[PDB]
């Protein structure tokens, strides 16, 4: 679904307050892209549907450590 494979961010619900303060029920989607992360210690790209601050966690912790606890949770790649 629309969940980040790194952060676990899914869609959130909320309102659409107008000028006359009418509430319309909407949904907050996360900023998901697909992206191919290069892994040196496998010599292989892994393509990963990830939110855009899930890539900030790749850039901070390394893909070799984020993939360590994607498979601890037991996901695709």
């Amino acid at each position: 679904s629309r969940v980040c494979q790194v952060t676990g961010k899914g869609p959130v619900t909320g309102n659409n307050i107008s000028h006359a303060h009418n509430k319309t029920r909407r949904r907050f989607l996360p900023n998901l892209q697909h992206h191919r992360f290069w892994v040196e210690s496998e010599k292989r790209f892994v393509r990963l549907r990830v939110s855009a601050k899930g890539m900030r966690i790749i850039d901070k912790r390394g893909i070799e450590a984020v993939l360590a606890d994607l498979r601890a949770r037991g996901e695709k790649f």
């Binding site: 290069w38 790209f45 890539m55 850039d59 390394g62």
Partner: protein
Amino acid sequence: EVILLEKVANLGNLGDKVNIKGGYARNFLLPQGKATVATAENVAAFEARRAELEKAAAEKKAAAEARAAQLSELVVTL
């Protein structure tokens, strides 16, 4: 935030640490064996391999000497 390792590019250095755009590290510099992020996990391992780089990086123009002498003969038949 990267350690460059080649010099035949437009702005490729070897010993300068530059601060560049975030996408330029992700997609080009890191997956091409051309850099690594500024981590202290092998930064002292760079200092025990400083004389292994001085062999292949010097033949890089020396093996492009006679290989270029068959590139300009224009002997491809159409």
